[PDB]
Amino acid sequence: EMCRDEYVMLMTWKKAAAGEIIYNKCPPNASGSASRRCLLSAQGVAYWGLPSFARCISHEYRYLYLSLREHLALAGEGMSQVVRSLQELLARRTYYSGDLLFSVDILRNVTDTFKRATYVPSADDVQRFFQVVSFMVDAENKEKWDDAQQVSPGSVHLLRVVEDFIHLVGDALKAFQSSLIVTDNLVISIQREPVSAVSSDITFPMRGRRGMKDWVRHSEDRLFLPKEVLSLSSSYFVIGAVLYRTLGLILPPPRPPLAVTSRVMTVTVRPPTQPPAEPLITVELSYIINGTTDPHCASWDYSRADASSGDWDTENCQTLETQAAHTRCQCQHLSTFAVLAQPP
Amino acid sequence: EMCRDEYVMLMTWKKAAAGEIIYNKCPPNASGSASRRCLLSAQGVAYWGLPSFARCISHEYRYLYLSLREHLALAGEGMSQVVRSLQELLARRTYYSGDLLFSVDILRNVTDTFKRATYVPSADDVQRFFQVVSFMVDAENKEKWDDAQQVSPGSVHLLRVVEDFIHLVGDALKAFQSSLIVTDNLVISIQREPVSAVSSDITFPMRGRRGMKDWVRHSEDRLFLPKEVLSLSSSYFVIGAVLYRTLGLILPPPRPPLAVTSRVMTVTVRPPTQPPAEPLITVELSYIINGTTDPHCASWDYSRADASSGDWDTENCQTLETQAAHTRCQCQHLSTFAVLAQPP
Ligand SMILES: *[C@@H]1O[C@H](CO)[C@@H](O)[C@H](O)[C@H]1NC(C)=O
Ligand SMILES: *[C@@H]1O[C@H](CO)[C@@H](O)[C@H](O)[C@H]1NC(C)=O
Ligand SMILES: C[As](C)(=O)[O-]
Ligand SMILES: C[As](C)(=O)[O-]
Numbered sequence: 001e002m003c004r005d006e007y008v009m010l011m012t013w014k015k016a017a018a019g020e021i022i023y024n025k026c027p028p029n030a031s032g033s034a035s036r037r038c039l040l041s042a043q044g045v046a047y048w049g050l051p052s053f054a055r056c057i058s059h060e061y062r063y064l065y066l067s068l069r070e071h072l073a074l075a076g077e078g079m080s081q082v083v084r085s086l087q088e089l090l091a092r093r094t095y096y097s098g099d100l101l102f103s104v105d106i107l108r109n110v111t112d113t114f115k116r117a118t119y120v121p122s123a124d125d126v127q128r129f130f131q132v133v134s135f136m137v138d139a140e141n142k143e144k145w146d147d148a149q150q151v152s153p154g155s156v157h158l159l160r161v162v163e164d165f166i167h168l169v170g171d172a173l174k175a176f177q178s179s180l181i182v183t184d185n186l187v188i189s190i191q192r193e194p195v196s197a198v199s200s201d202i203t204f205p206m207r208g209r210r211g212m213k214d215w216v217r218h219s220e221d222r223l224f225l226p227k228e229v230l231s232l233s234s235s236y237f238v239i240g241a242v243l244y245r246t247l248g249l250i251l252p253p254p255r256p257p258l259a260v261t262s263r264v265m266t267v268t269v270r271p272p273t274q275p276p277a278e279p280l281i282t283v284e285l286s287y288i289i290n291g292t293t294d295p296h297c298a299s300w301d302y303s304r305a306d307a308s309s310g311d312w313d314t315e316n317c318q319t320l321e322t323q324a325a326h327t328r329c330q331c332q333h334l335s336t337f338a339v340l341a342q343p344p
Numbered sequence: 345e346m347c348r349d350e351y352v353m354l355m356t357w358k359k360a361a362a363g364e365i366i367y368n369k370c371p372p373n374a375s376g377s378a379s380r381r382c383l384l385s386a387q388g389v390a391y392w393g394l395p396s397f398a399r400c401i402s403h404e405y406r407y408l409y410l411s412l413r414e415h416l417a418l419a420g421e422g423m424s425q426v427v428r429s430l431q432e433l434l435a436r437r438t439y440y441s442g443d444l445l446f447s448v449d450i451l452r453n454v455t456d457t458f459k460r461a462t463y464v465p466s467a468d469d470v471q472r473f474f475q476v477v478s479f480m481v482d483a484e485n486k487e488k489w490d491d492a493q494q495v496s497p498g499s500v501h502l503l504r505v506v507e508d509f510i511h512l513v514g515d516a517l518k519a520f521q522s523s524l525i526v527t528d529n530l531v532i533s534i535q536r537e538p539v540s541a542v543s544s545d546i547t548f549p550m551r552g553r554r555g556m557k558d559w560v561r562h563s564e565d566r567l568f569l570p571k572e573v574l575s576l577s578s579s580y581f582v583i584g585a586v587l588y589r590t591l592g593l594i595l596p597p598p599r600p601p602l603a604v605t606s607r608v609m610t611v612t613v614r615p616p617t618q619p620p621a622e623p624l625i626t627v628e629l630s631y632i633i634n635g636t637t638d639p640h641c642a643s644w645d646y647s648r649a650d651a652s653s654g655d656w657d658t659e660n661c662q663t664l665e666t667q668a669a670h671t672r673c674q675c676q677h678l679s680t681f682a683v684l685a686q687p688p
Contacts, residue, residue, distance in 0.1 A: 074547070077568050077626060120664040122674045124622050172665065 001046035003038035009051060018046040026056035032098060050143075053096035054151045060089055061099045061106075068109055076119030079110040083128050090135045097147040100136055101154045107132065108161045111168060120172040121165075127181055129165055133158070134183035137247050145250040153308040155250050159336070160302060162242065163268050166190055170238030180206070182213050185246050191239040195271070198227045204241040215245055220326040221263055224282035229334070233274040242266040248288055252310025254298065254340045261292045262327070262339035269334055279318055279332040286326040291344035295322050297329035298340050312340060345390035347382035353395060362390040370400035376442060394487075397440035398495045404433055405443045405450075412453055420463030423454040427472050434479045441491040444480055445498045451476065452505045455512060464516040465509075471525055473509055477502070478527035481591050489594040497652040499594050503680070504646060506586065507612050510534055514582030524550070526557050529590050535583040539615070542571045548585040559589055564670040565607055568626035573678070577618040586610040592632055596654025598642065598684045605636045606671070606683035613678055623662055623676040630670040635688035639666050641673035642684050656684060 006013045009027065016022045016038035026032045036051040064085050071078025086106055089095070095103075107129070114121055121129065136158065137145075148154045166188070173179065173192040176199055181188040189204045202225035207217045223241050230237050248260035262285040275281075283297070297317035301307060317331040319339075327339045350357045353371065360366045360382035370376045380395040408429050415422025430450055433439070439447075451473070458465055465473065480502065481489075492498045510532070517523065517536040520543055525532040533548045546569035551561045567585050574581050592604035606629040619625075627641070641661035645651060661675040663683075671683045 074568065118665055118667060120672075122623060122664070123662060 001040065001044065003046050003048045006048060011051070013048065013051070016048075026053065026096070029094075030056040030058045030096060030098070031062070032056040050147075052147045052150065054098050054101065054148045056096040056098040057102050058095055058099050060094065061102050064089060065102070065106060065109075068106060072113065075113055075117050076121075079113050079119070080122065080125050082106065082110055083125060083132060087128055087132050087135070090132060095144075097144040100141065100144055101148050101152055103132070103136060104154050104158045104161065107165075108157070111161050111165045115164065115168050121169065126165075126169055126179075130181050130186060130188055131183050133162060134185040137244065137250070138185055139246045139249055142246075142249045149250065153252075155247070156252075156302050156307045159266065163240070163266075163303075166240035166242075166268060167238045167270050170240060171236075173238075175236065180209060180211065182211055182216075184213070185244065187213065187216050187243045189239075189241045191241075193230065193237045193239065195230070195232060195235055195237055198230045198237060201226050202230075202239055202241070205243055216243065219263075219286050220284055220324060221265065221286050222282070222284045223265060223267060225267065225334075226280050229273060229275050229280055230269065231274050231276075233272045237273075238270050240266070240268045246288070248338055251300070251338075252308055254296075254310060254312045257342055258294070258296060258340040259343045260338050261289060261295075261341040261343055262287050264336060264338045266336045267334045273334060275333045277332070279316075279330045281331040281334065283317070283329040283331055283337045284326055285329065285337065285339050287339070287341070289343060290325070292341035294342045295319055295327045296340040297327065297331065297337070299331060299333070299335035299337050301335055312338075314340070345384065345388065347390050347392045350392060355395070357392065357395070360392075370397065370440070373438075374400040374402045374440060374442070375406070376400040394491075396491045396494065398442050398445065398492045400440040400442040401446050402439055402443050404438065405446050408433060409446070409450060409453075412450060416457065419457055419461050420465075423457050423463070424466065424469050426450065426454055427469060427476060431472055431476050431479070434476060439488075441488040444485065444488055445492050445496055447476070447480060448498050448502045448505065451509075452501070455505050455509045459508065459512050465513065470509075470513055470523075474525050474530060474532055475527050477506060478529040481588065481594070482529055483590045483593055486590075486593045493594065497596075499591070500596075500646050500651045503610065507584070507610075507647075510584035510586075510612060511582045511614050514584060515580075517582075519580065524553060524555065526555055526560075528557070529588065531557065531560050531587045533583075533585045535585075537574065537581045537583065539574070539576060539579055539581055542574045542581060545570050546574075546583055546585070549587055560587065563607075563630050564628055564668060565609065565630050566626070566628045567609060567611060569611065569678075570624050573617060573619050573624055574613065575618050575620075577616045581617075582614050584610070584612045590632070592682055595644070595682075596652055598640075598654060598656045601686055602638070602640060602684040603687045604682050605633060605639075605685040605687055606631050608680060608682045610680045611678045617678060619677045621676070623660075623674045625675040625678065627661070627673040627675055627681045628670055629673065629681065629683050631683070631685070633687060634669070636685035638686045639663055639671045640684040641671065641675065641681070643675060643677070643679035643681050645679055656682075658684070 003016045005015050018040035024034050032055040037049040039049045170190040178191040204223040244264040247264045297319040298312040298314045299316040300312045317329045320328040347360045349359050362384035368378050376399040381393040383393045514534040522535040548567040588608040591608045641663040642656040642658045643660040644656045661673045664672040
């Protein structure tokens with residue numbers, strides 16, 4: 001059977017035979033290519049899949065990239081303005097799946113220029129960087145990332161610029177100084193400690209601090225990181241912890257029976273640490289959906305080249321009590337942590 | 345213990361008991377009063393402090409004031425000649441601490457007469473005004489200002505006539521026109537923009553312009569003033585930026601641990617601006633001395649009545665990277681900016 005000619009999102013999709021991909025130029029909003037696949041169900045009936053705009057980039061986002069390029073050849077002040085623009089641009093919900101992938105690139109350029117120019121972002125710059133991130137990973141865009149990641153591992157890439165930005169910020173803090181950044185979909189703590197006199201255990205997130213969003217306060221997620229873990233494998237440890245509310249929905253998934261059903265915690269430390277062989281990291285993580293079963297604590301390294309495969313690691317962590325909408329994990333090496341489970 | 349009779353600078357200082365001030369008539373050069381304090385060290389030994397000539401005014405400077413007064417009761421041409429005379433007089437290094445304080449008054453009379461008579465100073469008049477200023481604030485006179493400012497806030501007063509003179513000049517420029525004035529100890533930019541169509545961001549100082557002194561070219565000080573800041577709280581903005589090389593040595597100091605260790609940038613704008621709540625002003629400032637620590641960016645309002653107190657403001661500005669003999673600041677409201685630090 002065949003999918004018939006449709007008009008959708010200002011584009012005509014010519015009749016197509018089951019199993020072939022049709023391509024069209026992106027809407028005049030943008031440039032690139034759009035695609036739609038003529039699928040065949042089980043009963044033998046052909047039906048149109050959804051159209052993909054992963055390779056479409058709104059002119060607005062291209063213009064913002066070119067300005068970014070103007071500033072590079074005062075650079076820092078330029079990147080401050082790029083992120084101001086990007087956030088304003090994203091808030092308008094005028095972007096295709098491919099504009100998200102292009103935003104990750106812009107954030108990398110911004111983050112790489114800040115490091116290259118030794119330009120410490122302002123306080124409002126940090127908050128705005130992570131508010132951009134919060135927009136991008138909002139569940140509202142769960143289907144756009146599903147479409148974006150068929151062409152490029154946008155989440156692997158985003159977590160890596162986030163890691164670079166965290167340590168750009170943390171590298172400017174004073175010894176024993178910390179900072180908290182709260183957004184709709186992330187909470188971030190950046191902490192700096194001397195390698196030879198790490199002051200205390202690291203816990204996170206500190207709910208007592210007024211400013212903490214509700215979804216964290218009325219929650220059970222927490223990190224306990226014993227100071228005994230912060231040991232060397234430059235003169236300061238930058239410790240960053242990120243609790244993503246929704247990121248689990250778009251990460252490389254685990255083997256089929258299971259699924260990322262929890263909030264996600266990243267714990268990055270530079271320089272590299274030699275963790276003890278005993279699992280000494282406590283990671284408690286709330287669930288994204290009521291009704292799960294068979295929890296498996298896991299860690300997943302977005303730094304590896306095969307990061308997009310989704311090789312989750314269930315031997316790093318030990319799964320302990322599951323209760324009150326969360327599960328506790330006891331993990332050995334630092335990484336990105338989640339509770340894999342069978343969804344309803 | 346007592347300080348014994350000394351003869352110094354053509355004056356006899358009678359024996360004095362520790363802690364009392366002795367007074368003498370000024371040298372015959374001048375009129376007024378000189379003073380010297382019999383101090384007591386920690387060990388209990390009395391010793392003469394230095395003599396103060398803050399209240400002495402050389403006859404030469406009094407004669408120049410009386411001529412100033414002749415011209416006022418053709419006035420403008422008179423004030424042109426006063427500044428010609430003052431500069432010639434200052435260049436001769438024949439002045440007491442009190443002649444400096446008297447020069448500030450003369451510059452106010454000159455500046456007030458120019459405004460009162462709507463007499464736009466010539467190009468050579470502007471340059472000569474600021475060359476007078478450069479002489480006066482040269483570090484050579486760092487001890488004279490220390491002596492002058494025990495009786496009158498000469499620097500608060502000088503910065504205010506400078507502000508009045510800048511806006512007298514700037515009020516005569518054409519729209520979008522600018523001017524640069526370079527001296528040994530200051531660099532001044534005066535810029536005029538329409539309130540409703542401010543053309544671009546203001547940066548300063550533009551080192552590319554040949555004519556720029558060396559101490560600025562081989563330096564890192566800079567202002568970035570986004571056009572977004574120039575918003576109203578008459579039909580034109582006069583924007584003046586002054587980078588003082590040495591002024592930090594004689595401004596009201598901060599709390600004891602810290603000290604004005606940097607070059608100083610004033611940024612005046614008339615009419616008054618309503619700045620955004622986000623800190624959008626970038627101020628980079630070089631250090632006056634190698635060896636500082638613990639930098640704190642600060643702003644200080646010489647317009648307030650308590651200006652002489654030295655209420656520096658460290659919440660206006662955010663201190664960012666410190667590197668290559670300067671420190672970057674990100675400030676919210678326009679003012680006079682410096683980097684306070686612990687000196688060696
Ligand atoms: C921006 O980042 C992208 C992706 O990381 C890279 O391909 C591109 O070369 C960068 N552009 C600039 C101007 O640095
Ligand atoms: C000159 O200025 C001084 C100080 O501002 C003031 O006291 C004096 O009255 C002025 N003299 C004239 C003639 O305007
Ligand atoms: C520094 As990491 C979170 O990639 O182990
Ligand atoms: C016009 As101003 C330098 O006193 O803020």
